[PDB]
Amino acid sequence: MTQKFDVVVIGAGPGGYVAAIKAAQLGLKTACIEKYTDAEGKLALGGTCLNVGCIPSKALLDSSWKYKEAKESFNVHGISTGEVKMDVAAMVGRKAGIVKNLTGGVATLFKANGVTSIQGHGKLLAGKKVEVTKADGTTEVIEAENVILASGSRPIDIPPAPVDQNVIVDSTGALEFQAVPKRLGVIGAGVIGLELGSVWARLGAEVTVLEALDTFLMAADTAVSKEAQKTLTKQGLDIKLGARVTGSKVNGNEVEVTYTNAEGEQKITFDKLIVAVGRRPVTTDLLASDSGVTIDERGYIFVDDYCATSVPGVYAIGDVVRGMMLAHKASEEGIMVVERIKGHKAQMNYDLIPSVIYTHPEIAWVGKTEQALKAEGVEVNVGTFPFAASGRAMAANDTGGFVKVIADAKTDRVLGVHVIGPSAAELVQQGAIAMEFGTSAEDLGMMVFSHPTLSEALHEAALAVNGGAIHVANR
Amino acid sequence: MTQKFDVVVIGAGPGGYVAAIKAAQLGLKTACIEKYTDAEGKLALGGTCLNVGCIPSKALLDSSWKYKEAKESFNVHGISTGEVKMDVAAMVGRKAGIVKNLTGGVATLFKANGVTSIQGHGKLLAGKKVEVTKADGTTEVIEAENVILASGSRPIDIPPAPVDQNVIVDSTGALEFQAVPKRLGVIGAGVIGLELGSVWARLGAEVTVLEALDTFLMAADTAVSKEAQKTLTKQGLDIKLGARVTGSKVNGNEVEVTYTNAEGEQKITFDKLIVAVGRRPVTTDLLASDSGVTIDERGYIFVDDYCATSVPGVYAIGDVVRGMMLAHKASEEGIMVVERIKGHKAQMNYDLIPSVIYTHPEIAWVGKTEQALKAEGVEVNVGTFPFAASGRAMAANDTGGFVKVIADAKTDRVLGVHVIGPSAAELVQQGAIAMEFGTSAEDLGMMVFSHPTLSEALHEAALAVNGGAIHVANR
Numbered sequence: 024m025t026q027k028f029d030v031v032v033i034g035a036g037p038g039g040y041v042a043a044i045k046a047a048q049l050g051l052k053t054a055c056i057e058k059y060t061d062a063e064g065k066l067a068l069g070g071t072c073l074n075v076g077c078i079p080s081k082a083l084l085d086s087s088w089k090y091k092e093a094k095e096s097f098n099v100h101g102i103s104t105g106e107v108k109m110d111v112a113a114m115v116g117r118k119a120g121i122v123k124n125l126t127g128g129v130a131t132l133f134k135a136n137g138v139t140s141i142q143g144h145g146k147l148l149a150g151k152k153v154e155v156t157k158a159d160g161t162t163e164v165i166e167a168e169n170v171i172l173a174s175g176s177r178p179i180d181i182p183p184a185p186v187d188q189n190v191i192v193d194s195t196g197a198l199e200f201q202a203v204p205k206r207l208g209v210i211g212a213g214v215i216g217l218e219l220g221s222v223w224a225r226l227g228a229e230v231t232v233l234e235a236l237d238t239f240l241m242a243a244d245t246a247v248s249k250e251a252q253k254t255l256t257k258q259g260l261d262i263k264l265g266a267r268v269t270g271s272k273v274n275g276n277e278v279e280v281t282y283t284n285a286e287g288e289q290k291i292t293f294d295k296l297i298v299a300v301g302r303r304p305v306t307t308d309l310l311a312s313d314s315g316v317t318i319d320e321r322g323y324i325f326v327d328d329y330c331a332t333s334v335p336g337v338y339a340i341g342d343v344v345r346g347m348m349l350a351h352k353a354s355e356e357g358i359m360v361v362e363r364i365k366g367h368k369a370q371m372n373y374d375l376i377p378s379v380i381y382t383h384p385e386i387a388w389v390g391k392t393e394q395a396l397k398a399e400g401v402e403v404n405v406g407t408f409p410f411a412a413s414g415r416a417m418a419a420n421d422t423g424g425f426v427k428v429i430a431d432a433k434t435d436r437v438l439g440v441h442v443i444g445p446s447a448a449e450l451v452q453q454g455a456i457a458m459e460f461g462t463s464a465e466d467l468g469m470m471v472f473s474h475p476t477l478s479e480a481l482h483e484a485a486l487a488v489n490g491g492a493i494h495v496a497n498r
Numbered sequence: 499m500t501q502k503f504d505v506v507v508i509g510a511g512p513g514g515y516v517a518a519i520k521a522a523q524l525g526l527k528t529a530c531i532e533k534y535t536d537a538e539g540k541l542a543l544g545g546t547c548l549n550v551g552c553i554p555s556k557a558l559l560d561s562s563w564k565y566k567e568a569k570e571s572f573n574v575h576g577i578s579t580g581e582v583k584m585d586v587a588a589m590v591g592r593k594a595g596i597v598k599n600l601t602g603g604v605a606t607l608f609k610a611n612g613v614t615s616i617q618g619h620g621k622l623l624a625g626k627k628v629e630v631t632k633a634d635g636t637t638e639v640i641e642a643e644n645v646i647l648a649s650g651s652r653p654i655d656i657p658p659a660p661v662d663q664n665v666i667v668d669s670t671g672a673l674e675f676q677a678v679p680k681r682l683g684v685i686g687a688g689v690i691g692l693e694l695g696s697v698w699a700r701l702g703a704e705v706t707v708l709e710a711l712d713t714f715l716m717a718a719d720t721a722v723s724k725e726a727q728k729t730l731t732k733q734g735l736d737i738k739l740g741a742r743v744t745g746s747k748v749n750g751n752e753v754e755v756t757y758t759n760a761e762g763e764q765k766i767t768f769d770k771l772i773v774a775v776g777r778r779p780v781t782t783d784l785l786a787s788d789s790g791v792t793i794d795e796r797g798y799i800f801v802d803d804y805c806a807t808s809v810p811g812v813y814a815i816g817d818v819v820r821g822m823m824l825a826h827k828a829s830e831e832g833i834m835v836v837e838r839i840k841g842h843k844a845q846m847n848y849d850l851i852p853s854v855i856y857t858h859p860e861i862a863w864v865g866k867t868e869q870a871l872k873a874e875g876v877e878v879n880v881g882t883f884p885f886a887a888s889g890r891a892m893a894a895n896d897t898g899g900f901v902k903v904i905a906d907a908k909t910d911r912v913l914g915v916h917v918i919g920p921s922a923a924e925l926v927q928q929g930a931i932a933m934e935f936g937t938s939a940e941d942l943g944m945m946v947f948s949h950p951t952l953s954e955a956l957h958e959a960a961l962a963v964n965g966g967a968i969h970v971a972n973r
């Protein structure tokens with residue numbers, strides 16, 4: 024009666040469900056354990072990303088942008104509308120429908136690939152045995168030749184502003200508001216905070232973003248974060264740096280927030296408050312005391328470059344291990360691990376994992392920032408092209424931003440591509456693909472880019488590296 | 499004394515003006531001769547592409563799509579408006595201001611780079627001598643060490659439908675309507691005809707496209723053209739294949755068109771008629787009898803792979819020579835010619851020039867079609883991914899279409915990338931960049947693509963080539 028599998032995956036987020044599908048495709052008898060259930064009380068796959076993360080946030084960002092554009096940027100095209108209105112419930116409902124479709128899609132993929140789906144909480148015991156606590160309390164132990172831990176992360180909750188799922192919410196609650204909060208506060212100016220604040224600012228919320236640090240998007244290239252702060256501020260996000268929240272007091276349907284900055288203590292009242300101060304790895308009841316799996320100082324499962332833990336045949340991927348907390352990072356780690364289980368020498372290039380921020384203008388990058396390369400003493404040539412000079416962007420009425428390409432001054436090898444503007448993620452992916460092949464700035468400049476397209480902005484920026492751009496003056 | 503230049507470029511379109519800027523950047527004393535001037539007396543730099551082609555069409559396509567979307571696809575996002583109306587004069591005026599800004603931009607680039615612009619009609623005489631006939635009829639002969647012929651193209655004019663720029667227009671008049679015609683006819687279902695028909699259909703015109711051939715977009719992959727005909731028909735373009743126009747009679751503010759199809763002669767009346775039956779190379783008074791420059795059977799200037807004519811030091815680029823009549827082809831041929839004048843061994847890869855159709859959904863491709871590869875006996879593996887399975891596309895409410903990757907069955911080398919759907923041009927550019935580096939489908943599949951992004955559809959299609967797609971069943 025004891026079930027035996029070649030691979031047992033704990034967690035069905037982008038890391039775990041992709042790993043499970045890949046394992047099954049490679050002929051490995053695979054099981055995937057997941058505890059999450061939807062509103063009908065049924066197993067729902069896809070993790071944070073699908074259910075309360077990437078997908079729902081992108082749906083609201085696209086809907087809210089259309090509303091803002093209709094209100095402010097239709098007249099220039101000769102288009103008049105009556106009063107523009109937003110049925111918030113319908114917007115949230117569209118998002119809920121997308122999530123339902125996609126979670127159903129993952130279940131379908133599991134069935135088509137032969138993945139054994141097991142609803143419950145999984146715990147790794149000694150000897151690669153996994154204890155599954157089923158939805159009804161029944162426990163069952165299964166045996167695995169290989170175990171993949173992909174338990175993900177959860178929002179950080181801080182004593183100064185505890186979430187109550189009503190007036191003070193985390194990112195999950197922020198995607199479920201029934202009405203536009205008249206005054207919205209956001210703690211944390213990270214990617215999640217800026218995305219969530221953008222959604223509601225577009226729909227009319229007076230938005231204030233309280234950020235404890237004195238830097239804005241420190242991971243982005245300095246020129247990109249400078250431009251981002253300027254534009255987001257103009258879009259109604261009152262971004263306050265050096266503003267550390269120290270306490271809060273919920274008074275019925277409002278919250279008075281206290282924070283400290285260069286001018287001492289300040290108080291501000293909001294109708295809703297979103298706490299977006301980071302995410303922490305989840306290992307809650309994931310490991311028996313004698314599992315042998317090492318956890319580092321910050322709660323992450325310790326792994327090598329191939330996602331192997333301290334225990335043979337046990338791997339860990341995604342948000343629960345070191346690295347950028349991104350969905351594509353999790354999925355590709357899952358692929359690597361399964362390929363390696365099959366004996367292939369798969370590996371990941373952590374230096375070419377792109378980052379995307381889905382504000383408008385979209386922000387994206389891959390490789391190193393200019394400030395980082397200068398700090399490391401690497402001499403570089405930089406080429407920039409603004410969308411204000413792009414005929415395609417002018418046609419689209421979306422000319423803010425630029426493309427920045429950074430190359431090694433001696434070898435001309437492209438070390439980083441940074442974009443703030445239309446189709447940023449797509450242009451950065453072009454850069455990433457070229458970088459995978461060890462492209463030089465000159466190699467990109469020598470290629471034929473379709474005209475007129477936003478892609479041309481990357482081509483011009485690459486040419487600008489060596490002072491050869493056609494559509495911008497060269498210095 | 500006679501003006502003397504290292505390079506004399508005849509024509510200031512994307513081939514000519516880019517060739518002029520680059521020559522100047524490389525230290526060559528350069529002149530660019532252009533005959534056309536706008537209503538404000540300014541030299542019409544940018545040629546067909548900027549003044550009456552690429553840019554104006556893209557501007558109207560973008561404005562008209564926003565109108566269609568607001569009327570038909572805002573409700574799903576929860577967005578309501580009053581009545582959505584289009585001020586056609588204002589839409590066309592926005593386009594006119596974009597054209598004015600960009601033409602001014604090229605003038606600024608010419609000045610910053612030291613290009614001597616000369617207003618007039620240039621003619622190549624024997625001995626690389628160029629006669630410029632000014633607008634007042636005066637002539638001046640300038641001496642050149644190198645001549646670049648970039649005279650471009652013009653619409654084909656046909657006896658059955660003479661253009662009067664009122665009831666019967668060509669592509670130039672089609673971008674200037676001041677009101678939506680109730681009934682619009684388009685002769686020719688080529689790229690230009692489909693784009694122009696789409697603009698007006700979106701704004702309420704009843705559009706009929708009369709095409710003499712029984713094929714539709716034969717240059718596109720069969721799966722792409724099939725989908726395109728289906729979706730364009732659903733958008734209100736009544737595309738009639740095998741319908742050859744034989745005559746037309748203007749009756750006041752109407753035109754009765756007579757055409758022949760499977761039921762013999764038919765008659766149909768329109769308020770406006772667009773003649774989009776192709777384009778022809780322009781060599782009108784471009785060459786003296788004894789210039790020595792060979793013209794082929796279709797009126798194109800004959801050139802080798804490096805755009806060199808039969809006369810040493812004389813080159814021809816863009817629409818006036820063989821190849822795809824595209825802006826990026828013209829510009830890159832311009833760059834190749836100039837680099838070679840300087841002694842560099844630059845080369846054009848005609849196999850990797852992408853094609854784009856700016857309808858909605860956008861269509862783009864690079865490399866070979868599946869039908870061509872089959873006809874040539876090349877064994878292939880095909881991978882397809884539909885946007886209906888893309889989380890990013892779902893969030894954007896734009897899921898129509900797919901990505902198709904074709905690889906050599908023996909070497910796995912990517913031979914073609916075809917896309918119909920959102921950001922088709924950008925995804926195709928990712929494919930073209932990879933193909934420049936000799937990518938295999940597996941190489942693309944091993945790269946990390948940001949999630950959620952439209953780019954992921956290319957990643958999945960690449961994986962599907964070898965039956966390894968994650969998000970669609972592999973059958």
Ligand SMILES: Cc1cc2nc3c(=O)[nH]c(=O)nc-3n(C[C@H](O)[C@H](O)[C@H](O)COP(=O)(O)OP(=O)(O)OC[C@H]3O[C@@H](n4cnc5c(N)ncnc54)[C@H](O)[C@@H]3O)c2cc1C
Binds near residue numbers: 033
């Ligand atoms: C609002 C928001 C927006 C985001 N937007 C983006 C974006 O645009 N792009 C991007 O790349 N990333 C984004 N992220 C991050 C992204 O969601 C994560 O990086 C990704 O979900 C990590 O995948 P994972 O598989 O590691 O973990 P998760 O997706 O968190 O999946 C872990 C799963 O394991 C389950 N689980 C945990 N413990 C157990 C157990 N013991 N037994 C059984 N099951 C268990 C959980 O129920 C969960 O379903 C966003 C996150 C948030 C919160």
Ligand SMILES: Cc1cc2nc3c(=O)[nH]c(=O)nc-3n(C[C@H](O)[C@H](O)[C@H](O)COP(=O)(O)OP(=O)(O)OC[C@H]3O[C@@H](n4cnc5c(N)ncnc54)[C@H](O)[C@@H]3O)c2cc1C
Binds near residue numbers: 618621651
């Ligand atoms: C409606 C429409 C839409 C289009 N859309 C696209 C698109 O989306 N993408 C794309 O790639 N292509 C598009 N094209 C095609 C594109 O415009 C051409 O391929 C491109 O302009 C060719 O550039 P060129 O430099 O060869 O010639 P042109 O742009 O035609 O420039 C030739 C110039 O030379 C001048 N000239 C001619 N003879 C002389 C002379 N004897 N002396 C001096 N000057 C002279 C002309 O006045 C003109 O300015 C489109 C065309 C049309 C009509």
Ligand SMILES: Nc1ncnc2c1ncn2[C@@H]1O[C@H](COP(=O)(O)O)[C@@H](O)[C@H]1O
Binds near residue numbers: 302
């Ligand atoms: N108490 C706090 N008040 C304000 N900002 C905070 C507080 N605690 C953390 N943060 C910020 O929250 C942000 C979270 O960023 P990230 O992890 O990228 O989402 C960081 O920039 C932190 O400085």
Ligand SMILES: Nc1ncnc2c1ncn2[C@@H]1O[C@H](COP(=O)(O)O)[C@@H](O)[C@H]1O
Binds near residue numbers: 686687689690775
């Ligand atoms: N008299 C005509 N009636 C209908 N279609 C025509 C006629 N003459 C040319 N065409 C079509 O016009 C199209 C021009 O397409 P292209 O050159 O790609 O822009 C071709 O597909 C021709 O078949």
